Structure formats: structure tokens, C-alpha cells
Design a protein that fits this description.
heterodimer; A: 19 residues; mainly alpha; 0% strand; B: 137 residues; Recoverin, domain 1; 2 domains; 8 helices; 2 strands; globular; binds calcium ion; phosphoprotein (chain B); calcium-dependent protein binding (chain B)
Chain lengths: 19, 137
């Protein structure tokens, strides 16, 4: 498990989805 | 300049949260569904334009090499507010767990805690805005 990948990947999705 | 393997794996994780059916491409409908679930309301024209701006080979969907091209070429506060559901300025483990299962993800308690610990700089066991910003910058 890569905690940084999972967290930053989810934050980058939120940033994209909220433009 | 460079792209590390860690940076590519993060872009790959992000791509996979949009690719809801796991078929290797993001459609307008998958984008629409994710954006609505995070509180946005794109029109059909906006969803089609967004896919078109990223769809470099023109087949009408986004694959990871196209997604990587856009992410390498490119509001952290508005994202922080998605995670900080009660708006008290601190992302708790419970809030992160909740945000992650609403994305359809399967996580253990230890896993959520490992993510809190990764972002937690001062060590109070929560993630404030400054720690959120430092994670992404
Ligand atoms: Ca798909
Ligand atoms: Ca394409
Ligand atoms: Ca909170
Ligand atoms: Ca903290």
C-alpha cells in the first residue's frame, strides 16, 4: 500500500473535478 | 522538468478514480458522474469540451497517456473543502474514510491512518489546510 499515492491521487481527482 | 515514478503513479491513481468501469478510458459520462458526486454540475457541452481538449487522438475518450499529457502540462482550497466536510479546518481520519468510500474505494483503518500520517506535519493526527497545500506543492 502506497499511502502518498492513494492520498495525492484522490486530491488530484478532486482538484480536477472542481476545476 | 522531470516526472518521477511516484508522480506518475499518482496521476495513474487519479485517472483510475475517473475510470469508473476500469476499461482504460474516461468518457463524458464517467466524468459527469464523478463531478456531480463531488458537488459540481457540468452541462453536456462542458463535458464534451473537457473530453475533447484532452482527447489527442480523437476517438472520443481519454486514455492514460492523454491524461498524463494534460497533467504534466498543467484551486487546492476548493478541494480541501470537499474533504473537510464539517468545515472546521481539520481533515479527520473519519472524514477521509468517508470521502474514500464515497469514491467507491476499499480501505482498512490502518490504511486511512497511514494516509493521515503521511500528510500530518505537526503531529496532531489531523490534516489542516497548510498541510494539505504542502502535500500538493
Ligand atoms: Ca471507463
Ligand atoms: Ca483518446
Ligand atoms: Ca473537519
Ligand atoms: Ca496536522
Amino acid at each position: 500500500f502506497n499511502a502518498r499515492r492513494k492520498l495525492k491521487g484522490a486530491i488530484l481527482t478532486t482538484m480536477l473535478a472542481t476545476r | 522538468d522531470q516526472l518521477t515514478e511516484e508522480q506518475i503513479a499518482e496521476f495513474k491513481e487519479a485517472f483510475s478514480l475517473f475510470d469508473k468501469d476500469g476499461d482504460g478510458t474516461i468518457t463524458t459520462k464517467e466524468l459527469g458522474t464523478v463531478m456531480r458526486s463531488l458537488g459540481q454540475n457540468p452541462t453536456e457541452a462542458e463535458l464534451q469540451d473537457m473530453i475533447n481538449e484532452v482527447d489527442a487522438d480523437g476517438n472520443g475518450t481519454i486514455d492514460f497517456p492523454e491524461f498524463l499529457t494534460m497533467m504534466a502540462r498543467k484551486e487546492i482550497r476548493e478541494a480541501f473543502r470537499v474533504f473537510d466536510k464539517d468545515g472546521n479546518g481539520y481533515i479527520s481520519a473519519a472524514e477521509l474514510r468517508h470521502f474514500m468510500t464515497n469514491l467507491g474505494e476499499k480501505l482498512t483503518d490502518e490504511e486511512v491512518d497511514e494516509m493521515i500520517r503521511e500528510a500530518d506535519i505537526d503531529g496532531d493526527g489531523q490534516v489542516n489546510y497548510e498541510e494539505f497545500v504542502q502535500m500538493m506543492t
